[PDB]
Amino acid sequence: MLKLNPYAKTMRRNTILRQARNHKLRVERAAAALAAKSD
Amino acid sequence: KGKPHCSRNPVLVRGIGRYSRSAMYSRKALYKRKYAALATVTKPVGGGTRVVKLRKMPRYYPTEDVPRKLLSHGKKPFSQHVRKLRASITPGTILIILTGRHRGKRVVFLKQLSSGLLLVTGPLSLNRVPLRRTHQKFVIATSTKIDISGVKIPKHLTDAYFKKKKKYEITEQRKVDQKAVDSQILPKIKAVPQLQGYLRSVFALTNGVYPHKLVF
Amino acid sequence: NFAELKIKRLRKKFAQKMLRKARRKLIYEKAKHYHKEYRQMYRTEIRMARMARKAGNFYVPAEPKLAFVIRIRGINGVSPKVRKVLQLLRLRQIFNGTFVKLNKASINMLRIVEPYIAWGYPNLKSVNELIYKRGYGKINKKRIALTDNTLIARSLGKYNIICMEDLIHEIYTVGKHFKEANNFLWPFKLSSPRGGMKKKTTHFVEGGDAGNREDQINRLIRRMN
Amino acid sequence: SGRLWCKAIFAGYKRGLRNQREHTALLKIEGVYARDETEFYLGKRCAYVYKAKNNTVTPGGKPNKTRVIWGKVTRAHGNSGMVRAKFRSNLPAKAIGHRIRVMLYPSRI
Amino acid sequence: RGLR
RNA sequence: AGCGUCGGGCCCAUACCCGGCCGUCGCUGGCAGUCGGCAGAGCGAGAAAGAGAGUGGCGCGGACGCUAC
RNA sequence: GCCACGCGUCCCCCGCGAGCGCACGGGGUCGGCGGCGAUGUCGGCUACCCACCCGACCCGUCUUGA
RNA sequence: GAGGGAGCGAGACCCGUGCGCCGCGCUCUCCCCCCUCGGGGGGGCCGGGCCACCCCUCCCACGGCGCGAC
Ligand SMILES: [Mg+2]
Numbered sequence: 001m002l003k004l005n006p007y008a009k010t011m012r013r014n015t016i017l018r019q020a021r022n023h024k025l026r027v028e029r030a031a032a033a034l035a036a037k038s039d
Numbered sequence: 040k041g042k043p044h045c046s047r048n049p050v051l052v053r054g055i056g057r058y059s060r061s062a063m064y065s066r067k068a069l070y071k072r073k074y075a076a077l078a079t080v081t082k083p084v085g086g087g088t089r090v091v092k093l094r095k096m097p098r099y100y101p102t103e104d105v106p107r108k109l110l111s112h113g114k115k116p117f118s119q120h121v122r123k124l125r126a127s128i129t130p131g132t133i134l135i136i137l138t139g140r141h142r143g144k145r146v147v148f149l150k151q152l153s154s155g156l157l158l159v160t161g162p163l164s165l166n167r168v169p170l171r172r173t174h175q176k177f178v179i180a181t182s183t184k185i186d187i188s189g190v191k192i193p194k195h196l197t198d199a200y201f202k203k204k205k206k207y208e209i210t211e212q213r214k215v216d217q218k219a220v221d222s223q224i225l226p227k228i229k230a231v232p233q234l235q236g237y238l239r240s241v242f243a244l245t246n247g248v249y250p251h252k253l254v255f
Numbered sequence: 256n257f258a259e260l261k262i263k264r265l266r267k268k269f270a271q272k273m274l275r276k277a278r279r280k281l282i283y284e285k286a287k288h289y290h291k292e293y294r295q296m297y298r299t300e301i302r303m304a305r306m307a308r309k310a311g312n313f314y315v316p317a318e319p320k321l322a323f324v325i326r327i328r329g330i331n332g333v334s335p336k337v338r339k340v341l342q343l344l345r346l347r348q349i350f351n352g353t354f355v356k357l358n359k360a361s362i363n364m365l366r367i368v369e370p371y372i373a374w375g376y377p378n379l380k381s382v383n384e385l386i387y388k389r390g391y392g393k394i395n396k397k398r399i400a401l402t403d404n405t406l407i408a409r410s411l412g413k414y415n416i417i418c419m420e421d422l423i424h425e426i427y428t429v430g431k432h433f434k435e436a437n438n439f440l441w442p443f444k445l446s447s448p449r450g451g452m453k454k455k456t457t458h459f460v461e462g463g464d465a466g467n468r469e470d471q472i473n474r475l476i477r478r479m480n
Numbered sequence: 481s482g483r484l485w486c487k488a489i490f491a492g493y494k495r496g497l498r499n500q501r502e503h504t505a506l507l508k509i510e511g512v513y514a515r516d517e518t519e520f521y522l523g524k525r526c527a528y529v530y531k532a533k534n535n536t537v538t539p540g541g542k543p544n545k546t547r548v549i550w551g552k553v554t555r556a557h558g559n560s561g562m563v564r565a566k567f568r569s570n571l572p573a574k575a576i577g578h579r580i581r582v583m584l585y586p587s588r589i
Numbered sequence: 590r591g592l593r
Numbered sequence: 594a595g596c597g598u599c600g601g602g603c604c605c606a607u608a609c610c611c612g613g614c615c616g617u618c619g620c621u622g623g624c625a626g627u628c629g630g631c632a633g634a635g636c637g638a639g640a641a642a643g644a645g646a647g648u649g650g651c652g653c654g655g656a657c658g659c660u661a662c
Numbered sequence: 663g664c665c666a667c668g669c670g671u672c673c674c675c676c677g678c679g680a681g682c683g684c685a686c687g688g689g690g691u692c693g694g695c696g697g698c699g700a701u702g703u704c705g706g707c708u709a710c711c712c713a714c715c716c717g718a719c720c721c722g723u724c725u726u727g728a
Numbered sequence: 729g730a731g732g733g734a735g736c737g738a739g740a741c742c743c744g745u746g747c748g749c750c751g752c753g754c755u756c757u758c759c760c761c762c763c764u765c766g767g768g769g770g771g772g773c774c775g776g777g778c779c780a781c782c783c784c785u786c787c788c789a790c791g792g793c794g795c796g797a798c
């Protein structure tokens with residue numbers, strides 16, 4: 001795919017970092033939910 | 040002159056770096072790193088001296104030759120291959136050695152070797168089964184592990200140790216290896232109740248028992 | 256001598272190396288600029304809506320420039336007025352596909368053969384899948400595979416069409432040089448539909464597959480590819 | 481020291497109404513009646529056994545009369561626990577309604 | 590030459 | 594296991610797809626370049642054309658090949 | 663986060679650096695293995711007979727139609 | 729799992745080697761530091777725009793409202 005269209009490195013390099021960061025936020029919201037009911 | 044450093048950019052996925060080449064020019068620090076710009080042998084004789092040749096052309100040629108072959112690229116050999124392993128099989132787990140003349144027996148795993156074949160030992164005392172190799176593909180993983188972490192089993196044993204030659208007599212060294220691993224493990228298996236009975240016992244199917252259906 | 260010639264031959268290869276690199280960097284920059292383009296195109300069509308509803312009116316979007324046609328039935332016993340049209344659209348085999356720019360002239364023919372085809376308005380991903388996976392150019396009257404850009408530059412360099420991406424751009428934006436871009440493409444040999452078909456004979460509205468099924472063509476492509 | 485294989489019956493070949501493509505074979509395994517269930521057996525080595533008049537070799541032993549045709553469970557067939565299987569040589573129709581020993585030892589676990 |  | 598309205602799932606044709614093989618047609622395609630101590634082994638590449646003359650400033654070596662009906 | 667990095671000169675405003683490895687890369691390889699055997703055993707498509715499963719109306723001809 | 733002579737290099741001061749085109753990119757030819765047990769693994773090494781937060785307001789597009797003009 002790169003031999004034909006090389007920009008795919010950046011297009012598939014992003015959309016990974018994005019997802020990991022957003023996964024961190026999902027977990028942070030769950031722990032803060034436990035903090036809100038407990039506190 | 041410089042010792043070889045590791046790859047600077049980490050691996051996220053096979054063949055894709057984490058960082059971009061523009062941050063990389065910096066990290067490598069290219070801003071301050073620009074550049075610009077036998078066959079004949081002499082020998083003595085008891086005459087003169089003879090200048091002999093090495094690697095002389097062959098005295099006979101054959102009647103016809105096969106041609107050259109093309110360069111394929113990705114085909115590494117077996118020694119150099121990477122060796123996989125299932126999640127179930129960790130050292131300690133109990134295996135069902137299904138196929139060989141030692142059929143359906145229950146036996147403890149020690150270690151994957153370089154080749155990828157499994158080191159297995161159905162305690163010779165109990166099962167009458169020595170240190171034997173097997174293959175993963177022909178083996179069931181039970182969920183009944185034990186904490187085998189603390190023994191310093193010898194390094195010397197290996198694939199070439201188990202490799203066939205071409206009568207078989209049992210070596211004293213073989214007897215030592217068996218005895219040496221036994222003295223270490225046997226109390227842990229005799230500590231847990233009924234388990235030595237289970238090990239002496241052999242696995243075997245019977246009526247109304249279907250592998251897909253049941254679970255273990 | 257074979258001294259000065261060696262050094263000269265090295266300069267010639269070095270020049271052609273730098274040239275190939277430069278074409279590579281150029282290619283990259285066209286593609287990133289088109290990503291920015293597509294993103295903009297998609298957002299604005301919503302923004303027009305939100306603001307329209309705020310005022311209380313209705314936003315009517317533009318008519319679709321492009322349609323993706325598929326022949327669903329076979330070669331036996333077909334009216335000759337049809338056959339002529341069909342072979343003008345290059346639909347000689349069953350489960351063959353073609354792109355078609357729209358206008359009164361084309362749409363009246365597709366009306367005349369409604370029962371034999373299934374068409375609609377295809378999405379961008381479907382265009383990628385089709386071109387990339389099954390791209391085969393008509394080069395010197397020969398069905399040759401679209402595996403390197405050289406094969407394109409030789410033929411279409413005169414329209415500044417150097418790569419798969421520019422091709423895509425023209426297709427989705429039905430630009431100037433559609434005729435040449437499509438006539439370059441060999442009729443798409445699509446396979447039989449995974450999952451199945453509802454009923455070959457009848458129109459969509461009476462529960463069939465023929466005729467205009469605007470967007471559901473994408474679902475059908477995913478089942479056929 | 482016991483039964484180390486699941487039972488299956490050779491129901492018939494792959495076939496339409498008036499044509500049978502006998503290079504493929506249909507198994508009906510005992511106690512399995514759903515496509516969920518047949519995902520276990522995938523990949524497994526089947527083995528049709530038979531016995532013949534004259535004495536033949538036997539690997540690891542003296543020559544027996546028994547012989548074998550090895551095979552392989554290809555993929556599921558149908559919705560009610562039937563299953564396709566492709567044997568290395570094509571099967572005889574005599575065997576219709578008989579036993580085949582599906583083994584276990586290409587495990588998928 | 591600028592690379593130099 | 595009938596009648597009417599419908600869902601998922603599922604079955605196979607010498608039809609469709611991917612791959613192997615035979616023959617024919619088309620490209621009026623390519624190949625006489627096996628140019629060897631008179632040698633230096635390329636001319637598939639996005640862009641009309643030249644690996645062009647000159648003149649001032651030790652060891653003796655290198656596979657197949659082409660009945661051109 | 664960036665396929666952004668001599669100096670001098672030009673514009674708008676403030677033609678030769680070499681070196682070494684990895685591989686989803688112009689069509690599969692192992693530099694990996696195991697069993698049987700000199701008088702009853704191995705291979706032997708075709709061709710000899712028998713069995714089973716499915717398929718299957720006797721040829722030539724005139725004929726719109728066998 | 730069809731196919732089977734792709735050549736790399738060194739150059740008329742040599743005569744080799746058969747991992748070679750296209751394509752992705754690691755280290756050394758800079759210098760320091762850090763961690764797990766000489767080997768293995770890390771942090772990096774300085775300049776410049778851009779967008780990131782907050783204060784100001786220019787050009788075009790489209791929509792709405794108001795005053796005014798034809
Ligand atoms: Mg299906």
Ligand SMILES: [Mg+2]
Nearest residue numbers: 497498716717
């Ligand atoms: Mg019948």
Ligand SMILES: [Mg+2]
Nearest residue numbers: 530531545546
């Ligand atoms: Mg028996």
Ligand SMILES: [Mg+2]
Nearest residue numbers: 499501606607
């Ligand atoms: Mg068929």
Ligand SMILES: [Mg+2]
Nearest residue numbers: 444610611612
């Ligand atoms: Mg084909």
Ligand SMILES: [Mg+2]
Nearest residue numbers: 722723724725
């Ligand atoms: Mg007659």
Ligand SMILES: [Mg+2]
Nearest residue numbers: 724725726727
């Ligand atoms: Mg007649």
Ligand SMILES: [Mg+2]
Nearest residue numbers: 724725726727
């Ligand atoms: Mg008559």
